[PDB]
Amino acid sequence: PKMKTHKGAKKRVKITASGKVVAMKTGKRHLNWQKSGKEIRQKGRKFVLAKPEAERIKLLLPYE
Amino acid sequence: MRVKMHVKKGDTVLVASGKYKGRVGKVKEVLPKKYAVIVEGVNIVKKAVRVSPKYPQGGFIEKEAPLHASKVRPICPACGKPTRVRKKFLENGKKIRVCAKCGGALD
Amino acid sequence: MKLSDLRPNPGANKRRKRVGRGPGSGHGKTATRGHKGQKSRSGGLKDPRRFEGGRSTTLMRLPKRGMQGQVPGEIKRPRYQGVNLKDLARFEGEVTPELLVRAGLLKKGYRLKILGEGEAKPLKVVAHAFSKSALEKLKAAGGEPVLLE
Amino acid sequence: GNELVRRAARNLPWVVTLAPEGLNVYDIVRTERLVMDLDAWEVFQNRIG
RNA sequence: ACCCGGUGAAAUUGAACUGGCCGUGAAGAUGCGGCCUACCCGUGGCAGGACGAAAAGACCCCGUGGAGCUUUACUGCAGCC
RNA sequence: GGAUGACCCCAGGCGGUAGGGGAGCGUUCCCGAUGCCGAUGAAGGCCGACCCGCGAGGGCGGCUGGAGGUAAGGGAAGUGC
RNA sequence: GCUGGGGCUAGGAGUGAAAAGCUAACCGAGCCCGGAGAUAGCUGGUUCUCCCCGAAAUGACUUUAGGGUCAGCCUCAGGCG
RNA sequence: CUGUUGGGAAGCAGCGCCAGAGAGGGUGAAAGCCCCGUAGGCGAAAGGUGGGGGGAUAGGUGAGGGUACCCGAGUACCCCGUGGUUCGUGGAGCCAUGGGGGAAUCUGGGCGGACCACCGCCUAAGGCUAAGUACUCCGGGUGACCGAUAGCGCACCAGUACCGUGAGGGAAAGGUGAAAAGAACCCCGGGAGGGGAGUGAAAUAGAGCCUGAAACCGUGGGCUUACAAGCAGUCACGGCCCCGAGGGGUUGUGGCGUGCCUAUUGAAGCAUGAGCCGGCGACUCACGGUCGUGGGCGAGCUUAAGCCGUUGAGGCGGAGGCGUAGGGAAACCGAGUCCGAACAGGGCGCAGCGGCCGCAAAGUCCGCGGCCGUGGACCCGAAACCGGGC
RNA sequence: GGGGGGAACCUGGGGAACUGAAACAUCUCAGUACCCAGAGGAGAGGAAAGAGAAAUCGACUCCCUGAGUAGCGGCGAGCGA
Ligand SMILES: [Mg+2]
Ligand SMILES: [Mg+2]
Ligand SMILES: [Mg+2]
Ligand SMILES: [Mg+2]
Ligand SMILES: [Mg+2]
Ligand SMILES: [Mg+2]
Ligand SMILES: [Mg+2]
Ligand SMILES: [Mg+2]
Ligand SMILES: [Mg+2]
Ligand SMILES: [Mg+2]
Ligand SMILES: [Mg+2]
Ligand SMILES: [Mg+2]
Ligand SMILES: [Mg+2]
Ligand SMILES: [Mg+2]
Ligand SMILES: [Mg+2]
Ligand SMILES: [Mg+2]
Ligand SMILES: [Mg+2]
Ligand SMILES: [Mg+2]
Ligand SMILES: [Mg+2]
Ligand SMILES: [Mg+2]
Ligand SMILES: [Mg+2]
Ligand SMILES: [Mg+2]
Ligand SMILES: [Mg+2]
Ligand SMILES: [Mg+2]
Ligand SMILES: [Mg+2]
Ligand SMILES: [Mg+2]
Ligand SMILES: [Mg+2]
Ligand SMILES: [Mg+2]
Ligand SMILES: [Mg+2]
Ligand SMILES: [Mg+2]
Ligand SMILES: [Mg+2]
Ligand SMILES: [Mg+2]
Ligand SMILES: [Mg+2]
Ligand SMILES: [Mg+2]
Ligand SMILES: [Mg+2]
Ligand SMILES: [Mg+2]
Ligand SMILES: [Mg+2]
Ligand SMILES: [Mg+2]
Ligand SMILES: [Mg+2]
Ligand SMILES: [Mg+2]
Ligand SMILES: [Mg+2]
Ligand SMILES: [Mg+2]
Ligand SMILES: [Mg+2]
Ligand SMILES: [Mg+2]
Ligand SMILES: [Mg+2]
Ligand SMILES: [Mg+2]
Ligand SMILES: [Mg+2]
Ligand SMILES: [Mg+2]
Ligand SMILES: [Mg+2]
Ligand SMILES: [Mg+2]
Ligand SMILES: [Mg+2]
Ligand SMILES: [Mg+2]
Ligand SMILES: [Mg+2]
Ligand SMILES: [Mg+2]
Ligand SMILES: [Mg+2]
Ligand SMILES: [Mg+2]
Ligand SMILES: [Mg+2]
Ligand SMILES: [Mg+2]
Ligand SMILES: [Mg+2]
Ligand SMILES: [Mg+2]
Ligand SMILES: [Mg+2]
Ligand SMILES: [Mg+2]
Ligand SMILES: [Mg+2]
Ligand SMILES: [Mg+2]
Ligand SMILES: [Mg+2]
Ligand SMILES: [Mg+2]
Ligand SMILES: [Mg+2]
Ligand SMILES: [Mg+2]
Ligand SMILES: [Mg+2]
Ligand SMILES: [Mg+2]
Ligand SMILES: [Mg+2]
Ligand SMILES: [Mg+2]
Ligand SMILES: [Mg+2]
Ligand SMILES: [Mg+2]
Ligand SMILES: [Mg+2]
Ligand SMILES: [Mg+2]
Ligand SMILES: [Mg+2]
Ligand SMILES: [Mg+2]
Ligand SMILES: [Mg+2]
Ligand SMILES: [Mg+2]
Ligand SMILES: [Mg+2]
Ligand SMILES: [Mg+2]
Ligand SMILES: [Mg+2]
Ligand SMILES: [Mg+2]
Ligand SMILES: [Mg+2]
Ligand SMILES: [Mg+2]
Ligand SMILES: [Mg+2]
Ligand SMILES: [Mg+2]
Ligand SMILES: [Mg+2]
Ligand SMILES: [Mg+2]
Ligand SMILES: [Mg+2]
Ligand SMILES: [Mg+2]
Ligand SMILES: [Mg+2]
Ligand SMILES: [Mg+2]
Ligand SMILES: [Mg+2]
Ligand SMILES: [Mg+2]
Ligand SMILES: [Mg+2]
Ligand SMILES: [Mg+2]
Ligand SMILES: [Mg+2]
Ligand SMILES: [Mg+2]
Ligand SMILES: [Mg+2]
Ligand SMILES: [Mg+2]
Ligand SMILES: [Mg+2]
Ligand SMILES: [Mg+2]
Ligand SMILES: [Mg+2]
Ligand SMILES: [Mg+2]
Ligand SMILES: [Mg+2]
Ligand SMILES: [Mg+2]
Ligand SMILES: [Mg+2]
Ligand SMILES: [Mg+2]
Ligand SMILES: [Mg+2]
Ligand SMILES: [Mg+2]
Ligand SMILES: [Mg+2]
Ligand SMILES: [Mg+2]
Ligand SMILES: [Mg+2]
Ligand SMILES: [Mg+2]
Ligand SMILES: [Mg+2]
Ligand SMILES: [Mg+2]
Ligand SMILES: [Mg+2]
Ligand SMILES: [Mg+2]
Ligand SMILES: [Mg+2]
Ligand SMILES: [Mg+2]
Ligand SMILES: [Mg+2]
Ligand SMILES: [Mg+2]
Ligand SMILES: [Mg+2]
Ligand SMILES: [Mg+2]
Ligand SMILES: [Mg+2]
Ligand SMILES: [Mg+2]
Ligand SMILES: [Mg+2]
Ligand SMILES: [Mg+2]
Ligand SMILES: [Mg+2]
Ligand SMILES: [Mg+2]
Ligand SMILES: [Mg+2]
Ligand SMILES: [Mg+2]
Ligand SMILES: [Mg+2]
Ligand SMILES: [Mg+2]
Ligand SMILES: [Mg+2]
Ligand SMILES: [Mg+2]
Ligand SMILES: [Mg+2]
Ligand SMILES: [Mg+2]
Ligand SMILES: [Mg+2]
Ligand SMILES: [Mg+2]
Ligand SMILES: [Mg+2]
Ligand SMILES: [Mg+2]
Ligand SMILES: [Mg+2]
Ligand SMILES: [Mg+2]
Ligand SMILES: [Mg+2]
Ligand SMILES: [Mg+2]
Ligand SMILES: [Mg+2]
Ligand SMILES: [Mg+2]
Ligand SMILES: [Mg+2]
Ligand SMILES: [Mg+2]
Ligand SMILES: [Mg+2]
Ligand SMILES: [Mg+2]
Ligand SMILES: [Mg+2]
Ligand SMILES: [Mg+2]
Ligand SMILES: [Mg+2]
Ligand SMILES: [Mg+2]
Ligand SMILES: [Mg+2]
Ligand SMILES: [Mg+2]
Ligand SMILES: [Mg+2]
Ligand SMILES: [Mg+2]
Ligand SMILES: [Mg+2]
Ligand SMILES: [Mg+2]
Ligand SMILES: [Mg+2]
Ligand SMILES: [Mg+2]
Ligand SMILES: [Mg+2]
Ligand SMILES: [Mg+2]
Ligand SMILES: [Mg+2]
Ligand SMILES: [Mg+2]
Ligand SMILES: [Mg+2]
Ligand SMILES: [Mg+2]
Ligand SMILES: [Mg+2]
Ligand SMILES: [Mg+2]
Ligand SMILES: [Mg+2]
Ligand SMILES: [Mg+2]
Ligand SMILES: [Mg+2]
Ligand SMILES: [Mg+2]
Ligand SMILES: [Mg+2]
Ligand SMILES: [Mg+2]
Ligand SMILES: [Mg+2]
Ligand SMILES: [Mg+2]
Ligand SMILES: [Mg+2]
Ligand SMILES: [Mg+2]
Ligand SMILES: [Mg+2]
Ligand SMILES: [Mg+2]
Ligand SMILES: [Mg+2]
Ligand SMILES: [Mg+2]
Ligand SMILES: [Mg+2]
Ligand SMILES: [Mg+2]
Ligand SMILES: [Mg+2]
Ligand SMILES: [Mg+2]
Ligand SMILES: [Mg+2]
Ligand SMILES: [Mg+2]
Ligand SMILES: [Mg+2]
Ligand SMILES: [Mg+2]
Ligand SMILES: [Mg+2]
Ligand SMILES: [Mg+2]
Ligand SMILES: [Mg+2]
Ligand SMILES: [Mg+2]
Ligand SMILES: [Mg+2]
Ligand SMILES: [Mg+2]
Ligand SMILES: [Mg+2]
Ligand SMILES: [Mg+2]
Ligand SMILES: [Mg+2]
Ligand SMILES: [Mg+2]
Ligand SMILES: [Mg+2]
Ligand SMILES: [Mg+2]
Ligand SMILES: [Mg+2]
Ligand SMILES: [Mg+2]
Ligand SMILES: [Mg+2]
Ligand SMILES: [Mg+2]
Ligand SMILES: [Mg+2]
Ligand SMILES: [Mg+2]
Ligand SMILES: [Mg+2]
Ligand SMILES: [Mg+2]
Ligand SMILES: [Mg+2]
Ligand SMILES: [Mg+2]
Ligand SMILES: [Mg+2]
Ligand SMILES: [Mg+2]
Ligand SMILES: [Mg+2]
Ligand SMILES: [Mg+2]
Ligand SMILES: [Mg+2]
Ligand SMILES: [Mg+2]
Ligand SMILES: [Mg+2]
Ligand SMILES: [Mg+2]
Ligand SMILES: [Mg+2]
Ligand SMILES: [Mg+2]
Ligand SMILES: [Mg+2]
Ligand SMILES: [Mg+2]
Ligand SMILES: [Mg+2]
Ligand SMILES: [Mg+2]
Ligand SMILES: [Mg+2]
Ligand SMILES: [Mg+2]
Ligand SMILES: [Mg+2]
Ligand SMILES: [Mg+2]
Ligand SMILES: [Mg+2]
Ligand SMILES: [Mg+2]
Ligand SMILES: [Mg+2]
Ligand SMILES: [Mg+2]
Ligand SMILES: [Mg+2]
Ligand SMILES: [Mg+2]
Ligand SMILES: [Mg+2]
Ligand SMILES: [Mg+2]
Ligand SMILES: [Mg+2]
Ligand SMILES: [Mg+2]
Ligand SMILES: [Mg+2]
Ligand SMILES: [Mg+2]
Ligand SMILES: [Mg+2]
Ligand SMILES: [Mg+2]
Ligand SMILES: [Mg+2]
Ligand SMILES: [Mg+2]
Ligand SMILES: [Mg+2]
Ligand SMILES: [Mg+2]
Ligand SMILES: [Mg+2]
Ligand SMILES: [Mg+2]
Ligand SMILES: [Mg+2]
Ligand SMILES: [Mg+2]
Ligand SMILES: [Mg+2]
Ligand SMILES: [Mg+2]
Ligand SMILES: [Mg+2]
Ligand SMILES: [Mg+2]
Ligand SMILES: [Mg+2]
Ligand SMILES: [Mg+2]
Ligand SMILES: [Mg+2]
Ligand SMILES: [Mg+2]
Ligand SMILES: [Mg+2]
Ligand SMILES: [Mg+2]
Ligand SMILES: [Mg+2]
Ligand SMILES: [Mg+2]
Ligand SMILES: [Mg+2]
Ligand SMILES: [Mg+2]
Ligand SMILES: [Mg+2]
Ligand SMILES: [Mg+2]
Ligand SMILES: [Mg+2]
Ligand SMILES: [Mg+2]
Ligand SMILES: [Mg+2]
Ligand SMILES: [Mg+2]
Ligand SMILES: [Mg+2]
Ligand SMILES: [Mg+2]
Ligand SMILES: [Mg+2]
Ligand SMILES: [Mg+2]
Ligand SMILES: [Mg+2]
Ligand SMILES: [Mg+2]
Ligand SMILES: [Mg+2]
Ligand SMILES: [Mg+2]
Ligand SMILES: [Mg+2]
Ligand SMILES: [Mg+2]
Ligand SMILES: [Mg+2]
Ligand SMILES: [Mg+2]
Ligand SMILES: [Mg+2]
Ligand SMILES: [Mg+2]
Ligand SMILES: [Mg+2]
Ligand SMILES: [Mg+2]
Ligand SMILES: [Mg+2]
Ligand SMILES: [Mg+2]
Ligand SMILES: [Mg+2]
Ligand SMILES: [Mg+2]
Ligand SMILES: [Mg+2]
Ligand SMILES: [Mg+2]
Ligand SMILES: [Mg+2]
Ligand SMILES: [Mg+2]
Ligand SMILES: [Mg+2]
Ligand SMILES: [Mg+2]
Ligand SMILES: [Mg+2]
Ligand SMILES: [Mg+2]
Ligand SMILES: [Mg+2]
Ligand SMILES: [Mg+2]
Ligand SMILES: [Mg+2]
Ligand SMILES: [Mg+2]
Ligand SMILES: [Mg+2]
Ligand SMILES: [Mg+2]
Ligand SMILES: [Mg+2]
Ligand SMILES: [Mg+2]
Ligand SMILES: [Mg+2]
Ligand SMILES: [Mg+2]
Ligand SMILES: [Mg+2]
Ligand SMILES: [Mg+2]
Ligand SMILES: [Mg+2]
Ligand SMILES: [Zn+2]
């Protein structure tokens, strides 16, 4: 039967126009009090997943 | 419901095929369970018999062997020719076998 | 042309790869699976798109973000699809949402919004919405924007 | 489309019979010649348009 | 038990034209090397070898295998309050 | 070179397990086939020191057999121990 | 005490002067049929031919360590030159 | 119809003929015209059906106006405990209800995802209702379905024999020939069996019957072997035998030489598996995905279920799906957008080849192929777990 | 009038586990297997105290689509209007 969309990926990740995979940076959920403004600021951005990991995630998203 | 038999005891038939092709003879017997007929004088085979009553000499007898009914064709008693069989409903309503060549009855 | 002359082009019908049918073929015995281990087995291997040998996976270590929704689900609100000016040049007189739907440009069940990529024609366009740039261009090539609902 | 014509030819071993609505390429390529009514010629033109 | 007449199994069996020593070899060789020894084929016997047969080691370990059992392991359910 | 495999010339590469790739053989079935081979002998069997093919195989001839088989080109698989 | 005949108690249940004994010739949970093609990261096995290339047994992480994910190393297609 | 070869004609040859019938099966081999059939037609006194045509019956039917009588009760409703739904306690409504409390009859009551307002929807606690849907013991039709280890477990006297106390398990086993013409009689022999005779186109078609492979056993012949050391072969030469400047069979001597498979760092290995032969025996299919590829169309491409047609004919159907725009958690904006106070910076995005004609191409559809996901998913194998019985 | 039978199909009353989550308990397998009651040539359902946002639709059943969408989910595996 037809593939099911992995909802964990769908809630974590976006496929961009040219087919990149973008996620929020990790490491600011907590324990933030002694991290610099630069570290809080820079983790506040999205980033482009390394290519092998990106292709694995894209296969979990067949109907985007 | 029945084995269709285009030939009867004991009308006259041509053996149209086989070793005895061309022979004309009387249908001695009809075997529906075998779709065969026996034709007088045709298909004579030598059967061996043990000494006994009926054959105190032993030896052999002659027997007419059966013929597959499709090798046989009635000779129409009107025109005397071998023919396929047609059906015809009489005035009373009964159906009889008639001759495809002329139209005569074959009984 | 005869029945016996009908044939596919070269490469149109390739023959299948058949494994485990002898030493000559390059695929005999192990059938290209290698030696032992999971994955050589009938049924082998967890989903390679996700599973990573027991450690936390690349996916699940990334954080969640955004509204995920909640029961009773998606909130009904008006939706917009955008059609650019350049895709209006095939049209004469007056473009409509229904006409744009017929052409294959606009999807059913989507309110119409005109966008500014391309150039404006002297057309009377009837749309639910217009970008600023799509208005100026249209209201400058002699076009007649018709906002509506 | 004339069924009397189709009934008359269909038992010849060298003839395949069709109504124009059944015109298909396999039966065309099967046969060495193509004989058509003008009424079937008309149907053919309507379908390939 | 042996011999003659009668009847006539079995596990096992890659194929075999299947010797000894001293070596070599996956580390204990009829099968490799070098030497020695040895005409062909059986019958009664003996059990040193064929890492002889039998049984996919019970010991041992391994498997995010199983089952019985225990308790102040976890979490439930009966029961009782 | 001739001119898009028309064949020739000269040159170089061509050990191989896991494994990647390419080209072929053969088996069953379908179109081809209302055809064609066939009792002046189908398939299958048994031989062969012959012919073609690198090979898987394909021919041909003799014997057996006694009623089936099936081309060029394609299609599909319960397809090779 | 032994014994015939007629009966009753059974599967997490019986029965046991207690051996986890016995419950139809293997009982730490009977048998049959079914769920069922349970599951087996284990062991075995995997069938025509020819041609070109051709590994790895490392690193990181892993209730992971004889299993995996990514990288490294092989191969094919298109591109670069 | 005839001639012909033949045991046999339907083959081959000559000359015809039918066809709304040249599907198919039989007949001594291969038949449109011999047979059974086929196309096209025809048919029920009796029983069953009758959803269709007709006829009966039951049944059915107004307006204002006033009245506020009635409109389904341990019910609604609330609370406790649960089930159902996509909803696993969640902001948890709705539908259902085991416990407790417990109404009103339209100015009544339920619902629109806690709740309240507003605005709308609907009438709970009585019942019935064809058709479109499912299934295949049964019947028929048809297969790029099987063809006796296959196909149902059973082509056959099979749920049998046999196994088990029982539930239950559960086989093997098809073919003489065109026709029995199934071999009178004689001979050896108790019989079995055979030799003759006879039949037959054929009798190693003789019933222990078509074909009749292989392992395995035997008889006869050629070459060879009793001083010889062996994975059994191979290379060379010589001798003998056979077919006719060659070839085949055989092997005396000499040279060389560690079975196959599996598993391993490493096996002839004294590590696994195999007595030997024959037959069965393992990478597939559906749907999705992802690349590549062969074609169709191209800012467009494409239908699904069904409907009509056909009876191995194809067409209709545009619902829908993919693509045409992205960015943002979102409101939203848009060739941009988001973060930001920003005209900052950054992230993610945005732009054919030849003379209007032509080729190509986004994309999309179908075919094919590689691999992935879901399914038992390459095949075989547990110890076990659960249910219902015995 | 009932009783009992009927290959599958159907409705109602009960209702597992292996397995998957590479352990496991919520979750999954699955209201599946199975037991039971009943029905019939079908069965169920069915004429709104409905849908849900259209100032709309208009019994129920069944197919396609909507859609692996909305959502649900040790927000895991998965489940899925
Ligand atoms: Mg599913
Ligand atoms: Mg999640
Ligand atoms: Mg996001
Ligand atoms: Mg954290
Ligand atoms: Mg935070
Ligand atoms: Mg802290
Ligand atoms: Mg610091
Ligand atoms: Mg700082
Ligand atoms: Mg700080
Ligand atoms: Mg920093
Ligand atoms: Mg900030
Ligand atoms: Mg790679
Ligand atoms: Mg995908
Ligand atoms: Mg994808
Ligand atoms: Mg979609
Ligand atoms: Mg008659
Ligand atoms: Mg005559
Ligand atoms: Mg006679
Ligand atoms: Mg007639
Ligand atoms: Mg009468
Ligand atoms: Mg009469
Ligand atoms: Mg008379
Ligand atoms: Mg194919
Ligand atoms: Mg394949
Ligand atoms: Mg290939
Ligand atoms: Mg091979
Ligand atoms: Mg081989
Ligand atoms: Mg290889
Ligand atoms: Mg292989
Ligand atoms: Mg092998
Ligand atoms: Mg393997
Ligand atoms: Mg491989
Ligand atoms: Mg492969
Ligand atoms: Mg593998
Ligand atoms: Mg592989
Ligand atoms: Mg392997
Ligand atoms: Mg290995
Ligand atoms: Mg390996
Ligand atoms: Mg292996
Ligand atoms: Mg491995
Ligand atoms: Mg392994
Ligand atoms: Mg491997
Ligand atoms: Mg695999
Ligand atoms: Mg791998
Ligand atoms: Mg799986
Ligand atoms: Mg597995
Ligand atoms: Mg861990
Ligand atoms: Mg959403
Ligand atoms: Mg015809
Ligand atoms: Mg015809
Ligand atoms: Mg033809
Ligand atoms: Mg035809
Ligand atoms: Mg026809
Ligand atoms: Mg016709
Ligand atoms: Mg037709
Ligand atoms: Mg032609
Ligand atoms: Mg003596
Ligand atoms: Mg003796
Ligand atoms: Mg004796
Ligand atoms: Mg005896
Ligand atoms: Mg024995
Ligand atoms: Mg040997
Ligand atoms: Mg030997
Ligand atoms: Mg010796
Ligand atoms: Mg010896
Ligand atoms: Mg010796
Ligand atoms: Mg040593
Ligand atoms: Mg030694
Ligand atoms: Mg020795
Ligand atoms: Mg040796
Ligand atoms: Mg050596
Ligand atoms: Mg030696
Ligand atoms: Mg030695
Ligand atoms: Mg030596
Ligand atoms: Mg010595
Ligand atoms: Mg003796
Ligand atoms: Mg002895
Ligand atoms: Mg002895
Ligand atoms: Mg001994
Ligand atoms: Mg001893
Ligand atoms: Mg010993
Ligand atoms: Mg040993
Ligand atoms: Mg020993
Ligand atoms: Mg041993
Ligand atoms: Mg042993
Ligand atoms: Mg023992
Ligand atoms: Mg075992
Ligand atoms: Mg062991
Ligand atoms: Mg053991
Ligand atoms: Mg122990
Ligand atoms: Mg140990
Ligand atoms: Mg253990
Ligand atoms: Mg563990
Ligand atoms: Mg482990
Ligand atoms: Mg364990
Ligand atoms: Mg346990
Ligand atoms: Mg050369
Ligand atoms: Mg070179
Ligand atoms: Mg060369
Ligand atoms: Mg090579
Ligand atoms: Mg390959
Ligand atoms: Mg077929
Ligand atoms: Mg044909
Ligand atoms: Mg001929
Ligand atoms: Mg002839
Ligand atoms: Mg055949
Ligand atoms: Mg042959
Ligand atoms: Mg070669
Ligand atoms: Mg040959
Ligand atoms: Mg000859
Ligand atoms: Mg032959
Ligand atoms: Mg025949
Ligand atoms: Mg063929
Ligand atoms: Mg061909
Ligand atoms: Mg197979
Ligand atoms: Mg093949
Ligand atoms: Mg083979
Ligand atoms: Mg007693
Ligand atoms: Mg007593
Ligand atoms: Mg007693
Ligand atoms: Mg008793
Ligand atoms: Mg008792
Ligand atoms: Mg009891
Ligand atoms: Mg028990
Ligand atoms: Mg039990
Ligand atoms: Mg006692
Ligand atoms: Mg028992
Ligand atoms: Mg027993
Ligand atoms: Mg016992
Ligand atoms: Mg015991
Ligand atoms: Mg147990
Ligand atoms: Mg148990
Ligand atoms: Mg047990
Ligand atoms: Mg017992
Ligand atoms: Mg038993
Ligand atoms: Mg059962
Ligand atoms: Mg069952
Ligand atoms: Mg299961
Ligand atoms: Mg199994
Ligand atoms: Mg397990
Ligand atoms: Mg395992
Ligand atoms: Mg095994
Ligand atoms: Mg193997
Ligand atoms: Mg290559
Ligand atoms: Mg190389
Ligand atoms: Mg290592
Ligand atoms: Mg490495
Ligand atoms: Mg390593
Ligand atoms: Mg470990
Ligand atoms: Mg260790
Ligand atoms: Mg460990
Ligand atoms: Mg390994
Ligand atoms: Mg392992
Ligand atoms: Mg890898
Ligand atoms: Mg490299
Ligand atoms: Mg690569
Ligand atoms: Mg290249
Ligand atoms: Mg280069
Ligand atoms: Mg004659
Ligand atoms: Mg004739
Ligand atoms: Mg003729
Ligand atoms: Mg016909
Ligand atoms: Mg037919
Ligand atoms: Mg016929
Ligand atoms: Mg013919
Ligand atoms: Mg015929
Ligand atoms: Mg034929
Ligand atoms: Mg015929
Ligand atoms: Mg015919
Ligand atoms: Mg008719
Ligand atoms: Mg009729
Ligand atoms: Mg009728
Ligand atoms: Mg009526
Ligand atoms: Mg009415
Ligand atoms: Mg009224
Ligand atoms: Mg009224
Ligand atoms: Mg009142
Ligand atoms: Mg009411
Ligand atoms: Mg009431
Ligand atoms: Mg109450
Ligand atoms: Mg309420
Ligand atoms: Mg409570
Ligand atoms: Mg409640
Ligand atoms: Mg639910
Ligand atoms: Mg709930
Ligand atoms: Mg719930
Ligand atoms: Mg709720
Ligand atoms: Mg309620
Ligand atoms: Mg209540
Ligand atoms: Mg009201
Ligand atoms: Mg009220
Ligand atoms: Mg309510
Ligand atoms: Mg409410
Ligand atoms: Mg509502
Ligand atoms: Mg609301
Ligand atoms: Mg409502
Ligand atoms: Mg109502
Ligand atoms: Mg009803
Ligand atoms: Mg119905
Ligand atoms: Mg049937
Ligand atoms: Mg039938
Ligand atoms: Mg077949
Ligand atoms: Mg058989
Ligand atoms: Mg059978
Ligand atoms: Mg046979
Ligand atoms: Mg078979
Ligand atoms: Mg049967
Ligand atoms: Mg049956
Ligand atoms: Mg059987
Ligand atoms: Mg029997
Ligand atoms: Mg018994
Ligand atoms: Mg027993
Ligand atoms: Mg018995
Ligand atoms: Mg049993
Ligand atoms: Mg049988
Ligand atoms: Mg036989
Ligand atoms: Mg016969
Ligand atoms: Mg004959
Ligand atoms: Mg006598
Ligand atoms: Mg006598
Ligand atoms: Mg005598
Ligand atoms: Mg005598
Ligand atoms: Mg006597
Ligand atoms: Mg006798
Ligand atoms: Mg004799
Ligand atoms: Mg005799
Ligand atoms: Mg004779
Ligand atoms: Mg004889
Ligand atoms: Mg013979
Ligand atoms: Mg014979
Ligand atoms: Mg025969
Ligand atoms: Mg025979
Ligand atoms: Mg024999
Ligand atoms: Mg023989
Ligand atoms: Mg033999
Ligand atoms: Mg002999
Ligand atoms: Mg001899
Ligand atoms: Mg001799
Ligand atoms: Mg000497
Ligand atoms: Mg000598
Ligand atoms: Mg010697
Ligand atoms: Mg010698
Ligand atoms: Mg050799
Ligand atoms: Mg030698
Ligand atoms: Mg020499
Ligand atoms: Mg010679
Ligand atoms: Mg020689
Ligand atoms: Mg000599
Ligand atoms: Mg030597
Ligand atoms: Mg050796
Ligand atoms: Mg080998
Ligand atoms: Mg091993
Ligand atoms: Mg080892
Ligand atoms: Mg290795
Ligand atoms: Mg040994
Ligand atoms: Mg050995
Ligand atoms: Mg051992
Ligand atoms: Mg060995
Ligand atoms: Mg081992
Ligand atoms: Mg092995
Ligand atoms: Mg054995
Ligand atoms: Mg044996
Ligand atoms: Mg042997
Ligand atoms: Mg074998
Ligand atoms: Mg595959
Ligand atoms: Mg399959
Ligand atoms: Mg296929
Ligand atoms: Mg596919
Ligand atoms: Mg696909
Ligand atoms: Mg694909
Ligand atoms: Mg494609
Ligand atoms: Mg197209
Ligand atoms: Mg194009
Ligand atoms: Mg968005
Ligand atoms: Mg802002
Ligand atoms: Mg800026
Ligand atoms: Mg920017
Ligand atoms: Mg940029
Ligand atoms: Mg394309
Ligand atoms: Mg893949
Ligand atoms: Mg499955
Ligand atoms: Mg399975
Ligand atoms: Mg399996
Ligand atoms: Mg697979
Ligand atoms: Mg369990
Ligand atoms: Mg358990
Ligand atoms: Mg247990
Ligand atoms: Mg029980
Ligand atoms: Mg009982
Ligand atoms: Mg009863
Ligand atoms: Mg009943
Ligand atoms: Mg049910
Ligand atoms: Mg139920
Ligand atoms: Mg139920
Ligand atoms: Mg229970
Ligand atoms: Mg469980
Ligand atoms: Mg479990
Ligand atoms: Mg599963
Ligand atoms: Mg698990
Ligand atoms: Mg697991
Ligand atoms: Mg476990
Ligand atoms: Mg579990
Ligand atoms: Mg659960
Ligand atoms: Mg399941
Ligand atoms: Mg469930
Ligand atoms: Mg069931
Ligand atoms: Mg019906
Ligand atoms: Mg009904
Ligand atoms: Mg009502
Ligand atoms: Mg509705
Ligand atoms: Mg209305
Ligand atoms: Mg209404
Ligand atoms: Mg209506
Ligand atoms: Mg959609
Ligand atoms: Mg859920
Ligand atoms: Mg789930
Ligand atoms: Mg759920
Ligand atoms: Mg569920
Ligand atoms: Mg629902
Ligand atoms: Zn006459």
CSV table of N, CA and C in Angstrom, one decimal, chain C residues 100-105:
chain,number,residue,atom,x,y,z
C,100,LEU,N,-9.3,31.1,-15.5
C,100,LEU,CA,-8.0,30.7,-15.1
C,100,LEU,C,-8.0,29.3,-14.6
C,101,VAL,N,-9.1,28.8,-13.9
C,101,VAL,CA,-9.2,27.5,-13.5
C,101,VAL,C,-9.2,26.5,-14.7
C,102,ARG,N,-10.0,26.9,-15.7
C,102,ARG,CA,-10.1,26.0,-16.9
C,102,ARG,C,-8.7,25.9,-17.6
C,103,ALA,N,-8.0,27.0,-17.7
C,103,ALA,CA,-6.7,27.0,-18.4
C,103,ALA,C,-5.7,26.0,-17.8
C,104,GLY,N,-5.9,25.6,-16.6
C,104,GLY,CA,-4.9,24.9,-15.8
C,104,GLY,C,-3.9,25.7,-15.1
C,105,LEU,N,-4.1,27.0,-14.9
C,105,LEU,CA,-3.2,27.9,-14.2
C,105,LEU,C,-3.6,28.0,-12.7
